[PDB]
């Protein structure tokens, strides 16, 4: 139940404001900046502020803070979801989210803001559907918004019927400084870019552990997805009844399902790093990277960030394979490797200087984060089985999909 | 299928070598099609196995079945989940319709000795589906 959705800037100027209820004075935004400054300088800054009886719940964008005032006990989660939908719409309409578009796209921004939410209740958020009634370059609204299917416009015709899938893996690892891994979760993400003719009803089928157990095939390699979050197109009743994944894909690239399950297997990359930090004299970086992944897979663009001293200078890198660059902006040793064959082992021996005078305040120990991205490798073992493309007109679809394995929260706690 | 014919002798020898009673990861061939085995494909495979021999009367074992499924998946791209048999005790019917192979006793179902026996009626009669309608949905 937001009161006024506004767009701020990095200096406190309200780039654009659009009140939906009028229950909050338009001059209350002037106190948001001083309140945020007071909160950030005392450690009490929060995305949801409070100006007397008025709360300012907002998120931080690339260059603007999407603040939305409210007064009653509105659903803060609803406000956050509306802000996220607005950010996604802005990203879909404008390729960049900066001040260069707020002062230049006011003609369409006001229309989008007016159409998106009325009286504090958003009603339309489909960027592909919204692109048919509000344009920056108007006919009656499409029947898709009034119709039940509000994510697939009817009458779409293409010369071919190509659906490209993207099974992107997310390897998140939380390795403590003692050498054990605490949080090792794998978050699957099936992102497809559908290009079909008509309103096809895709019937996705994978090698799910629950599906295999129900069929009676609970003995082969089946992914044990603890959490499966389907898109709005996926029918919840069909999935709940017998694990039937039936949904009409939209036109373009979108996130169909987002799997999330834990993993009890050894890490793909083992990072044995040591720190021979002499007191104000020098330091050594005995970093060893052991690839526990399969030797048949190659991790393209391996980037193991090694946080070196913030005041380190005159650095030297004695490594084995891969370029080693020290970035003073990020204050870390960027162990960049282009191609790392599975089972490979690269050894590096860093050595940098240190000022004689000690620092005034502590600097902390940022965790070492690898940036491995191994294509054509599914760690969870989930394999797509079938995709029932059904159309009333009748056509022969050509489904396609690729598996990409990358690093998620692949951090390693330092000593 | 020249590749299938070539792999049949080595596969049969490996299965015979394995008694009736190290590398991690799941590599995938790039651009290699992967889909469940079809009824026609299963029938063709059963006919080829019957003609060439080596599977009819061979003692049923987990290792041999796994090796056969892996070889079939490597040579054709068929997931190794269609080579399932109905739970015992007694004759085990193939879960996938079209497969003409079944396990019959040779003497708890896990201790009963079973062997592969050809059955052309399986490709037309869904014994597994009738026995386990819930397993077929």
């Amino acid at each position: 139940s937001a009161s006024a959705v506004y767009v701020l800037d990095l200096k406190g100027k309200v780039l654009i404001c659009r009140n939906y209820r009028g229950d909050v004075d338009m001059s209350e935004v002037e106190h948001f900046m001083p309140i945020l400054m007071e909160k950030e300088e005392e450690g009490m800054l929060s995305p949801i502020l409070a100006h007397g009886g008025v709360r300012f719940m907002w998120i931080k964008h690339n260059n603007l803070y999407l603040v939305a005032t409210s007064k009653k006990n509105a659903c803060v989660s609803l406000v956050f979801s509306f802000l996220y939908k607005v950010v996604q719409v802005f990203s879909e309409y404008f390729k960049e989210l900066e001040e260069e578009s707020i002062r230049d796209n006011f003609v369409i921004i006001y229309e989008l803001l007016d159409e998106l939410m009325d009286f504090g209740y958003p009603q339309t958020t489909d960027s592909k559907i919204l692109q048919e009634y509000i344009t920056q370059e108007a006919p009656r609204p499409p029947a898709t918004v009034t119709n039940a299917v509000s994510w697939r416009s009817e009458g779409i015709k293409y010369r071919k019927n190509e659906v490209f899938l993207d099974v992107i893996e997310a390897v998140n690892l939380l390795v403590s400084a003692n050498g054990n891994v605490l949080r090792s979760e794998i978050v699957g993400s099936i992102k497809m870019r559908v290009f079909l003719s008509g309103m096809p009803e895709l019937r996705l089928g994978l090698n799910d552990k629950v599906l295999f157990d129900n069929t009676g095939r609970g003995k082969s390699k089946s992914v044990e997805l603890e959490d499966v979050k389907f898109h709005q197109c996926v029918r919840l009743s069909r999935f709940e009844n017998d694990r039937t994944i039936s949904f009409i894909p939209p036109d373009g690239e979108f996130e169909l399902m987002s799997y999330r399950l834990n993993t009890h297997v050894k890490p793909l990359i083992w990072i044995e790093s040591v720190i021979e930090k002499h007191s104000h004299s020098r330091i050594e970086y005995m970093v060893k990277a052991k690839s526990q992944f399969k030797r048949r897979s190659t991790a393209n663009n391996v980037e193991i960030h090694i946080p070196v001293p913030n005041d380190a200078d005159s650095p030297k890198f004695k490594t084995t394979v891969g370029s080693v660059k020290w970035v003073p902006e990020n204050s870390e040793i960027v162990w960049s490797v282009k191609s790392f064959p599975g089972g490979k082992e690269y050894l590096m021996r860093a050595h940098f200087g240190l000022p004689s005078v000690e620092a005034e305040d502590k600097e902390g120990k940022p965790p070492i984060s690898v940036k491995f991205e191994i294509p054509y490798f599914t760690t969870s073992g989930i394999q797509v089985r079938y995709l029932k493309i059904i159309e009333k007109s009748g056509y022969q679809a050509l489904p396609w999909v690729r598996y990409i394995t990358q690093n998620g929260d692949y951090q390693l706690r330092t000593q | 299928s020249k590749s299938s014919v070539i792999g049949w002798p080595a596969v049969r020898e490996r299965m015979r070598r394995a008694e009736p009673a190290e590398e991690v990861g799941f590599p995938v061939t790039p651009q290699v099609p992967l889909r469940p085995m079809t009824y026609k494909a299963a029938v063709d495979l059963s006919h080829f196995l019957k003609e060439k021999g080596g599977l009819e009367g061979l003692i049923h074992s987990q290792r041999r079945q796994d090796i056969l499924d892996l070889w079939i998946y490597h040579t054709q791209g068929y997931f190794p989940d269609w080579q399932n048999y109905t739970p015992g005790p007694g004759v085990r019917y193939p879960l996938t319709f079209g497969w003409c192979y079944k396990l019959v006793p040779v003497e708890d179902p896990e201790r009963e000795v079973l062997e592969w026996r050809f059955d052309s009626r399986l490709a037309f009669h869904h014994v597994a589906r009738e026995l386990h309608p819930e397993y077929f949905k």
């Binding site: 294509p375 089985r385 493309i389 999909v401 598996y403 990409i404 | 889909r35 469940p36 079809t38």
Partner: peptide, 18 residues
């Protein structure tokens, strides 16, 4: 070609389960 693994064709349904 494409970085992250070559795209592969998918099936239509579980042909082995009818």
């Amino acid at each position: 070609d494409r970085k992250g693994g070559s795209y592969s064709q998918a099936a239509g349904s579980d042909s082995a389960q009818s």
